[PDB]
Design a binder for this molecule. Sequence first.
Ligand SMILES: CCn1nnc(O)c1C[C@H](N)C(=O)O
Ligand SMILES: CCn1nnc(O)c1C[C@H](N)C(=O)O
Ligand SMILES: [Cl-]
Ligand SMILES: [Cl-]
Ligand SMILES: [Cl-]
Ligand SMILES: [Li+]
Ligand SMILES: [Li+]
Ligand SMILES: [Li+]
Lengths: 263, 264
Amino acid sequence: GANKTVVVTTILESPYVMMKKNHEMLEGNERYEGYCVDLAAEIAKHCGFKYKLTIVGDGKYGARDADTKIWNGMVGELVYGKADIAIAPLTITLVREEVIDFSKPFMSLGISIMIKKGTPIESAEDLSKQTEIAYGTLDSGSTKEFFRRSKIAVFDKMWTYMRSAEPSVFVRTTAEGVARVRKSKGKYAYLLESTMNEYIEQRKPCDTMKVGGNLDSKGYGIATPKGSSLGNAVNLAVLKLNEQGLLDKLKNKWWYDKGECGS
Amino acid sequence: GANKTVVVTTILESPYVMMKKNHEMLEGNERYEGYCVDLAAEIAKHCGFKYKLTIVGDGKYGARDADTKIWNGMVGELVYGKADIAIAPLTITLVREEVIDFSKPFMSLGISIMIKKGTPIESAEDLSKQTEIAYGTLDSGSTKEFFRRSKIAVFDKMWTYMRSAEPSVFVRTTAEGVARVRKSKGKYAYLLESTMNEYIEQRKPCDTMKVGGNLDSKGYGIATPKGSSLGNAVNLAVLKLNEQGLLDKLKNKWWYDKGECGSG
Ligand SMILES: CCn1nnc(O)c1C[C@H](N)C(=O)O
Ligand SMILES: CCn1nnc(O)c1C[C@H](N)C(=O)O
Ligand SMILES: [Cl-]
Ligand SMILES: [Cl-]
Ligand SMILES: [Cl-]
Ligand SMILES: [Li+]
Ligand SMILES: [Li+]
Ligand SMILES: [Li+]
């Protein structure tokens, strides 16, 4: 049929999508800026579609409820037909690949540790062998699932602690995790993906640090409902944008050119 | 060949695929060892297929010949129906994605610079601003195409130099490029992917090193002919092996540092 506006699900997560300064008097896509706003414009230009950015209603990346088997977050929006594409820092995982389609990755990353500067932790093993410093992950996504599924002793030990810790060590948004690190006087460390950790390290008051090696190696993909005809063109666009240097330019723009912690 | 046997095309490139010691008295898949040999076994077990390892006849990764329009290398063996899958350090690129299918990546890497130790080069920008030290890439693959297509000033300047350099700076195999670095007394530098550069730096004769940051960020994928029924299961197997930690285990095994250079 005739062209329809493509509904893009995404998540309010700096620097991927952020409210523009004057958003209160703006409408539609003009309300937003960021890495994924720019990426959406490039993908749409290369693929020849018009689109509307829509923030995921529940604020989540996406996980499947073990009891009901219902998917939430951006994954759920695609699975249940509420959006046509997700353009967000959404990790390619096996359980998600089984239910939605993904482009080849537009960014490479791994789980990492965020500390308040001066915290005496250098590794996941360090966290797992002490109890003074609490630690947790984001809810409803790939990082929490990594710990729940790991057979590696250090990560099983960490999961066994986190799942039963009181008060809860899990957070609903990345921003809540950052605040918990910043306000906890060294007594909370946050487990999150490396490029988000790197972003926060460039933001005032410049009081957090990424420590240790990444725990894994994976990627973000542009996601579509399984079998959607949009997937092929979107994937070719991702590969072209990578090869032309545009994805590197966008990371540099939003992470480093705009950094607040010096040169 | 035998029914139900998946023909795997791969390439001799250490430590991905190597001839075992005394391979002359071995047969079939047992002749070979390395990261991609182990990966092929893991993929085949997860997907439930028997397979035959074959070394690509022309020794190339794969590009589309500018004149004849014919794909060569492992890509060509898939395109023309000679192999059923490629399991190799084969880079996922746009031009290849248009003609073959790829899994999600099993390894992440980028183009990098190999110098003979002591060469006064620290970056791609350094190479681009001088002419005493020649530099080049492998023929018939993703690294050459990267420079040919790039509009980034430094990389465009490097391409303009490399494409007309005499004698030619392009090499037929990674081994030829490394040998040329070693024998050129600092006057040749080689552009090759990072994981290989790192493997070579930690081994005798301990005379090369990786310098500068990676020039790009990309991945190796398992390739199948476009539309092949094998692709879906192979992709899920790559993701499962990554999530189980097995790809990291394989990397750590085949890049294990026994201390050939320094302390280990
Ligand atoms: C900024 C994204 N992010 N940073 N840390 C975590 O855990 C996430 C979410 C993850 N990419 C997902 O798809 O669940
Ligand atoms: C070990 C592989 N490699 N190291 N440097 C280059 O250029 C290559 C080949 C490349 N992965 C291709 O698919 O063409
Ligand atoms: Cl460089
Ligand atoms: Cl430029
Ligand atoms: Cl290991
Ligand atoms: Li999928
Ligand atoms: Li066969
Ligand atoms: Li393809």
